[model samples]
Target chain A: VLSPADKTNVKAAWGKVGAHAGEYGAEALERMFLSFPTTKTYFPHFDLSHGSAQVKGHGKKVADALTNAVAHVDDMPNALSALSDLHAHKLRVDPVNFKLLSHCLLVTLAAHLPAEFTPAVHASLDKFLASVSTVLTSKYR
Target chain B: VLSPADKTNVKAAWGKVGAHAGEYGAEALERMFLSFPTTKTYFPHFDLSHGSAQVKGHGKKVADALTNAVAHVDDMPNALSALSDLHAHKLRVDPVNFKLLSHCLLVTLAAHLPAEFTPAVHASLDKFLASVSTVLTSKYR
Candidate 1:
């Protein structure tokens, strides 16, 4: 449901965020844990302490997912279909957690990409994340 | 953030939900577990299965908070100050879980109060939960 401008801005911004998405993902995950400690329960096997490589590895996977989503922004539902089933029936990830991670990722990007994260860009990125979140949660029973 | 109309609709809808808020809360909590099993981890000490009295008791408490919130929709943060602190600090409830419960509550209401859950009423209640969710998680570190 992105507008023309939103799509354009999203592509432009992803140009920057995609460059270092892994680092940003790790920071966002770390921030989520610090701000909402209950989120860490999802990854009890993770070291979860600040700057752990385990978190960094998982963050890379998260980043790769977004990177792939960005590539298929016009068809996110299909692009993310596999993840959707995994999160819903398999892992049973509550859709609500997507919002939390979305908020953290936006904050992380803003902090790291101050120059690129203008008001318009932030809004576009937000829409992109919301879309991805919806796709990931669409399979819930 | 609510409009005048939104405020009116929320109070009216609460007339139905708040009447049996505890039963609604329990059902919503149970639905959340079924739809998203990860949510059950939050209540590790409880039985957490269907129709448990412990869940019902906690649901009643959840209902009481929402009922109290309905009384002061104009200033939810202050009205729910004690609960906000308990969730953010003491219990460390992640802001994300709020959305899960909010979704389940709406579904439960829709099932039980079919005639009352008009499109307009649903939107108003959604806004109300979003507002409450924001206030509860305002204490992020």
Candidate 2:
């Protein structure tokens, strides 16, 4: 949708989005954590306090990770496969837990992200959350 | 927020998110387009009557543009500058138009993006839309 006009609009809109980056950044992480409440249990375990600076730091981390991941969306099989293998071998967790965590992540997003987060955005995320939850429930082995 | 447990939860959640990608994909594009009714007006102006393939082709073009734009998030100056240049030069749409467009984009997102589209997501987009709309107002010159 990046037609010359669309691009103009988006750029202009982003100018607004940027002004409240701190707010959105915080909300994004907050919603993410909330989606999976259980995920928060470990926050204290690792001393992940809720503070503006800390939250911004974490938000940047996430933004960076997402940037990298999405940048490589085209190389999904190779990139994801290698990462998946690493998680399988090194990361100690279950699929269900991961879904739960994502729920929290999205919720955290709700808390943050700003006006762009509309009813439509909510529904989209809800569907996304439920669908993910369902998949988590059906894990084999 | 990527605690070991959170990481596990995210992976499981992604699995579910991935499961419904096909449905989500269609919904996402439609929702995104609809969210910003005004923005859709700026599309290459496809005549969907051609055929499903033709429609799909147009959709892909829109999606590619959006994807490219999103990819530039990390480089804020480049991102904003590109956006600023577009507004300053080519498409001199009103700032209010950006708000209208962003609103429609979020609505489109809700209509399509996967499962339920939660309150959290809605709230975030609302705030984001407002913030974006507000920011664009300054670039109206």
Candidate 3:
């Protein structure tokens, strides 16, 4: 469980991120593909190359999902479970990929909010991402 | 504004759609691409031909978003505004395309729920989709 203070910081930081969600989301996704080349395999149809329309649009989608999840933090499980089901049952995305994306998301968040992304905020966001992954992978078990 | 009866019908029908969101979403997207070939221009990376991972995964995302929006119908504007922003500002998807997709989505719903897709239900869903399109395109004006 996140402390009230942690939730407060997360909410505030996410509010800022949400405002520029498309740009930040694109940046994070770009980082993900660059840092983990294997991740691109899942998106075989997407151009996956830098500055592609597909990449930018897909990145906005990632950010939009995260923004929604953050808004519904109290109902994270319900908010994200459908995606988990789709990824696990249909798409068969490796569970580990979520973690890799989370790492890149952190990098994106930190880059965007350098001052607000303090250690405390980082810890809080890390826990939130872990929870997101856990819920997403629950169906696998 | 949706009448209480309209809301009830939409919610009930959407509940069924939500249950098989992945499948229904995939079907809707496939139909959209097939019926409106020009829509494919936006997704140059996707294999919209048939039965591709990209088609299925992206379809699920669309379905999942609609499912979530249905669940939160009381807050439709907030629920879907981010998607609208992304499509309008970043992706630059033509607003008219949403109507085309909605038409295809209705066909998908009608095909799946022949009985429940009654005239009243169709009208309700149409209004709901229109609301979705309106909210999504709000950023443009």
Candidate 4:
């Protein structure tokens, strides 16, 4: 659904963004992690500190992803089908964001009051969040 | 569209994740930040490292949100209509995640090829990603 203007702009940008997409990906992620703390819940196993080499490495994959997406901007869904699994369906973000936000809700509760946000409650909220996530994203396909 | 088994589990859990849900929300966020690296892109404006009191503050809002969604697992669209904006519609994550990933991609491109990823290219890729994100989440509503 990109307008002629958007398409033109997109293609033009890709021309320049070629080559160093990986490094850019790393900084972008770094920017997000450093700026927004709540968004960090997605990675419970990574070294998220400033200047993380791990981030840089993963960013290369991010770079490749952009290239792939750019190649097929006009055919997004089909183009990114495999990637979507990692996110939307394949993986780009389909429903994972819902779960991420859902869990953030859990942590929000836990931080506010451990006594009331008991383990039992935590478990329930987890299930609850997961359920809502499914509903919200069920239509994405 | 939940199974009886899931319904039972979700409801039971909500009952326990009550009252102190706000506090719990904070820790859950903390846990996620400590856990994942890439998920942090959603929050590009908040502090993301260890025991952020700022996170706890937002966790309270997160607590309230879960309560809303938990109350309406069955009637999602109409139920969490307002809240979804904060994420799905207004905001709860409808297509915002796509943008987050898209920008991560922009950064990806920039990092990998700063020379090519000129400001103009960055702008274009930004637009391209946004376009793709719209297509991917167009069906969420």
Candidate 5:
């Protein structure tokens, strides 16, 4: 069990961990899609031939939304529920799809981040997902 | 100029867009690192040769951090600042390295999210980077 001191340390470490997560995390996601190539087909058909300029625009939209989600990881169920309802109405996608995509995403991370990826990190992540998934399932119910 | 109604629509659209961002975003980052191969060298080292358990562990850690970062994309300056501190401390890297890595990351995003890539996104991101860079520089000052 984590003592009070340990918990404090863990929280601080996780905060720092969250920071690295944004950069490499963004990189990892971009790489996974590029490598798969076929995955690009999943994107909504919109004009993006504007080159690097458009790339930055879309990327920020993405980064902004994602950062919002991560900032409240502790309250992820509430967050995912909000996201689930919003997505259900707008994108009209199945919540299960998010789970599946998340699975593929983590696999890609395993193949990338290498050593710094640790056991404790995995446990915390699984816990986080479990919280979010509950909200997703509840939304479907 | 987004009015309340327009903002609602855009917010709804953002949710849908955000979902896609999370799904493909994860895939994109992973594929990019895989393409570079050497990028994994930048990750924190951990022992995971024992079995898939360790691999899964690190994978979730990566996912949690990435997802957390994604969820908080609006506060990107905070995200970047957090990353700047972490790399400088844990990795013992210089601040310039953050700018370099971020540029590489920006290039990778351009290559991946070709659909939503747009002039608007670029302008927004440049603003983001410029803002974050100022914060970082001031930290040193």
Candidate 6:
């Protein structure tokens, strides 16, 4: 659990991230693809080459979903359960990939907000991301 | 079909809309529930009342999806088909309610973007929203 101050800082930074969600989201997804090439197999039809239109679009989607999760942090369990169910049951995404994506997402946040991405903020976001990953992966078991 | 100028206008205005997507989306959903009460049946567990958390979160989802569709307008059909199938097959939402929601969405956009909500812009958005409704309902027929 985050301290109140930590939550406040994380939320404040997330607000900024949401403001430029498309760009940040695209970058994070691109990083994920670059660092974890196997992730691309899930999107066989998508143009996996760097900076491709499909990558950008999918990246924006990830960002949008993240922003939505942030906005409803208090309701995290329910807010993410639908997504978890879809990924696990419908899309059949490997549960481990969400963790990989979360790692890339954190790197994206750090790169975009170097000054604001303090260690405390990173810790808070890590907790939040872990909760999200847990909720998303619960259905897999 | 949207002309080049119409597309540009829609996309630019949408960027502004996307920046505060959560707020606008919630407002739109609230308006939908208020103006078209029957739509509430689709979400029995949700608090459809004004200012509810669920309403706000769901509203944001709507706005996020719309913004994504705008970003990849060329792939709008494919971008939205999954949503259509979810509503039609999984959720079993009444197809008519989508039209009702689209009407509320337009009203919300006009209210928020009064200065830029010219007739041409409205026409373009109307067409775009209609396509969404058509695709969402396609599985019903």
Of the candidates shown, which would achieve the greatest lDDT relative to the real structure?
A: 1
Q: How would the candidate models be sorted by TM-score, starting from the highest?
A: 1, 3, 6, 4, 5, 2
Worst 10 residues of 1 chain A by lDDT: A132-141
After superposition, the stretches of candidate 5 with alpha carbons farther than 4 Å from their true spots are: A1-14, A17-22, A32-42, A46-74, A80-82, A104-115, A133-141, B1-141
Candidate 1 lDDT over B32-71, as tens digits, reads 9899888878778989766789989988989888889989
Worst 10 residues of 4 chain A by lDDT: A131-140
TM-score chain B for all models. 0.94, 0.45, 0.92, 0.57, 0.43, 0.87
Q: Which digits, one per residue and each the tens of the lDDT, describe model 5 over residues B24-133?
A: 43443455445555555555474323333444454445334444444454454455556445544456544454455455545645766566456656544443443344
Top model number, TM-score? 1
How high is each candidate's interface RMSD, in Å?
13.1, 14.7, 16.3, 10.3, 15.7, 20.2
Model 4 C-alpha lDDT per residue in residues A1-141, reported as the tens digit of each score: 233444544455445556766766676666566555766766779999877888889878865865766577545555544543454433334554455444443443354445555454454444433433433342133
For candidate 1, the TM-score is 0.51
The sequence of per-residue lDDT tens digits that candidate 2 reaches over residues A1-141 is: 122343333334334454455455556666656555665654563435566577676666544443343334323233334444443445534566656555555555555556756665554444333433332232122
Error of 1 at B126 (Å): 0.4
In model 4 chain B, the worst 10-residue window by lDDT is B132-141
True contacts kept of each: 0.00, 0.00, 0.00, 0.11, 0.00, 0.00
The digit string of per-residue lDDT tens for model 4 on B84-115 reads: 33444333445544554444434433444445
Candidate 5 local lDDT, residue B120: 55
Poorest lDDT segment (10 consecutive residues) of candidate 6 chain A: A132-141
* TM-score for predicted model 5 compared with the true structure: 0.34
Give the per-residue lDDT of model 3 (tens digit) for B61-101: 98888887888877776777679778767888877899999
The DockQ assigned to candidate 1 is 0.03
Candidate 4 DockQ vs. native: 0.06
- Identify the leading candidate in terms of DockQ: 4
DockQ scores of the candidates = 0.03, 0.02, 0.01, 0.06, 0.02, 0.01
Candidate 6: regions farther than 4 A off: A1-3, B1-141
**Per-model TM-score on C-alpha atoms:** 0.51, 0.31, 0.49, 0.36, 0.34, 0.47
